[PDB]
Design an enzyme around this catalytic site. Sequence first.
Site, PDB file in Angstrom:
ATOM      1  N   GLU A  37       1.724 -10.784  -2.407  1.00  0.00           N
ATOM      2  CA  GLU A  37       1.198  -9.724  -1.588  1.00  0.00           C
ATOM      3  C   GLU A  37       2.204  -8.736  -1.049  1.00  0.00           C
ATOM      4  OE1 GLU A  37      -1.259 -11.340   1.506  1.00  0.00           O
ATOM      5  OE2 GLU A  37      -2.906 -11.835   0.111  1.00  0.00           O
ATOM      6  N   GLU A  83      -6.241 -14.902  -4.880  1.00  0.00           N
ATOM      7  CA  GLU A  83      -6.334 -15.485  -3.546  1.00  0.00           C
ATOM      8  C   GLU A  83      -7.517 -14.879  -2.807  1.00  0.00           C
ATOM      9  OE1 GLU A  83      -2.556 -16.061  -1.184  1.00  0.00           O
ATOM     10  OE2 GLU A  83      -3.715 -14.845   0.211  1.00  0.00           O
TER      11      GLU A  83
HETATM   12  O1  LIG Z   1      -4.457  -7.676   6.475  1.00  0.00           O
HETATM   13  N1  LIG Z   1      -4.745  -8.172   5.426  1.00  0.00           N
HETATM   14  O2  LIG Z   1      -5.554  -7.792   4.605  1.00  0.00           O
HETATM   15  C1  LIG Z   1      -4.044  -9.424   5.081  1.00  0.00           C
HETATM   16  C2  LIG Z   1      -4.426  -9.984   3.862  1.00  0.00           C
HETATM   17  C3  LIG Z   1      -3.794 -11.134   3.555  1.00  0.00           C
HETATM   18  C4  LIG Z   1      -2.761 -11.782   4.305  1.00  0.00           C
HETATM   19  O3  LIG Z   1      -1.992 -12.911   3.841  1.00  0.00           O
HETATM   20  C5  LIG Z   1      -2.416 -13.749   2.831  1.00  0.00           C
HETATM   21  O4  LIG Z   1      -3.600 -14.412   3.078  1.00  0.00           O
HETATM   22  C6  LIG Z   1      -3.528 -15.565   3.897  1.00  0.00           C
HETATM   23  C7  LIG Z   1      -4.338 -15.373   5.181  1.00  0.00           C
HETATM   24  O5  LIG Z   1      -3.669 -14.400   5.991  1.00  0.00           O
HETATM   25  C8  LIG Z   1      -2.083 -15.973   4.118  1.00  0.00           C
HETATM   26  O6  LIG Z   1      -2.104 -17.332   4.573  1.00  0.00           O
HETATM   27  C9  LIG Z   1      -1.836 -17.394   5.971  1.00  0.00           C
HETATM   28  O7  LIG Z   1      -0.442 -17.169   6.106  1.00  0.00           O
HETATM   29  C10 LIG Z   1       0.046 -17.257   7.426  1.00  0.00           C
HETATM   30  C11 LIG Z   1       1.504 -16.807   7.463  1.00  0.00           C
HETATM   31  O8  LIG Z   1       2.205 -17.617   6.525  1.00  0.00           O
HETATM   32  C12 LIG Z   1      -0.166 -18.726   7.864  1.00  0.00           C
HETATM   33  O9  LIG Z   1       0.336 -18.940   9.175  1.00  0.00           O
HETATM   34  C13 LIG Z   1      -1.669 -19.046   7.802  1.00  0.00           C
HETATM   35  O10 LIG Z   1      -1.804 -20.447   8.072  1.00  0.00           O
HETATM   36  C14 LIG Z   1      -2.119 -18.866   6.333  1.00  0.00           C
HETATM   37  O11 LIG Z   1      -3.515 -19.069   6.166  1.00  0.00           O
HETATM   38  C15 LIG Z   1      -1.378 -16.001   2.740  1.00  0.00           C
HETATM   39  O12 LIG Z   1      -0.030 -16.428   2.878  1.00  0.00           O
HETATM   40  C16 LIG Z   1      -1.200 -14.524   2.402  1.00  0.00           C
HETATM   41  F1  LIG Z   1      -1.164 -14.419   1.026  1.00  0.00           F
HETATM   42  C17 LIG Z   1      -2.491 -11.104   5.549  1.00  0.00           C
HETATM   43  N2  LIG Z   1      -1.494 -11.609   6.479  1.00  0.00           N
HETATM   44  O13 LIG Z   1      -0.831 -12.624   6.309  1.00  0.00           O
HETATM   45  O14 LIG Z   1      -1.304 -10.959   7.508  1.00  0.00           O
HETATM   46  C18 LIG Z   1      -3.107  -9.920   5.930  1.00  0.00           C
END
Ligand SMILES: O=[N+]([O-])c1ccc(O[C@@H]2O[C@H](CO)[C@@H](O[C@@H]3O[C@H](CO)[C@@H](O)[C@H](O)[C@H]3O)[C@H](O)[C@H]2F)c([N+](=O)[O-])c1
EC number: 3.2.1.4
Length: 300
Positions: A136, A225
């Site tokens: 990402e 994902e």
């Molecule tokens: O704004 N968005 O569209 C967006 C989309 C996807 C995304 O990030 C993505 O989607 C998930 C949910 O955000 C993340 O997983 C989350 O990662 C966090 C940081 O490692 C952990 O603490 C949490 O337990 C885990 O579920 C994945 O690493 C990342 F590929 C994120 N993000 O991490 O902020 C933002």
Amino acid sequence: SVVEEHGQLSISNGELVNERGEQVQLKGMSSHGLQWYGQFVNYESMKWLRDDWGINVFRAAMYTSSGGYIDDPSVKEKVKEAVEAAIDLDIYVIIDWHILSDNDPNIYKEEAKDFFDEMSELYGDYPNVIYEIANEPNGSDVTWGNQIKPYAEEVIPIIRNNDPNNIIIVGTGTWSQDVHHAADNQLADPNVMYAFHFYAGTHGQNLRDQVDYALDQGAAIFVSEWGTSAATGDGGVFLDEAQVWIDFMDERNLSWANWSLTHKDESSAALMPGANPTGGWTEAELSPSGTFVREKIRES
Ligand SMILES: O=[N+]([O-])c1ccc(O[C@@H]2O[C@H](CO)[C@@H](O[C@@H]3O[C@H](CO)[C@@H](O)[C@H](O)[C@H]3O)[C@H](O)[C@H]2F)c([N+](=O)[O-])c1
């Protein structure tokens, strides 16, 4: 006998196809970060997923930062363990260089080249492997044309020197949502797919129309994902909107991996606290998200 039956995957007219040229759709699970929840990635849990859920793909999410590969490279051995189990279980496997806080894939491009050289040398003569070179990309300063495409054009050659045509999934801008820009300026390699990621907590009708725009440019899309939760991975489970996306993906023959296989106390986690890391989960050991995802794959 998924891999024995479909064998070499490739892209034909923007569609994922098997070695007979027939459309194929992969559906499975992604691990959570291997530096944190690596115990859920093993032959026994992957076999349980194959046999009880019906998975035909598993994604090994190797975070680069956040205590991942750059800080402690030992996690690459857990990726090898997952690839070997997928080979032994005759399912597909995605090797994910899981960038996130390291928001520009160019930050660790030298290490990425070395890592993909090693993985493609080791596994480049198996049909199971799918390489996902930058989970990402994110940030206003990280664009397809200036950062992501040039990064792919350095890493893909490394892979191709060892493995000429296994699928490579390339991340897109804005946390792998900006498939529109990528589809208007596609990579030359014929076996590339662009990643599209969604979270059901976000109203998704325009994002579906954006995926359609990209498909209409002949770009192949892999939903490497997605979650039933909000975009943070937590905040509620949104099964109505997830069903809309499931039906959408079926109509467009889009392959996918759900986030994620862990017992972490967050809505997107598929398992509850007492779930055995080696599988055999009862209905009570699955979270509301895991129950739904399992049903979707079993139905398929
Ligand atoms: O704004 N968005 O569209 C967006 C989309 C996807 C995304 O990030 C993505 O989607 C998930 C949910 O955000 C993340 O997983 C989350 O990662 C966090 C940081 O490692 C952990 O603490 C949490 O337990 C885990 O579920 C994945 O690493 C990342 F590929 C994120 N993000 O991490 O902020 C933002």
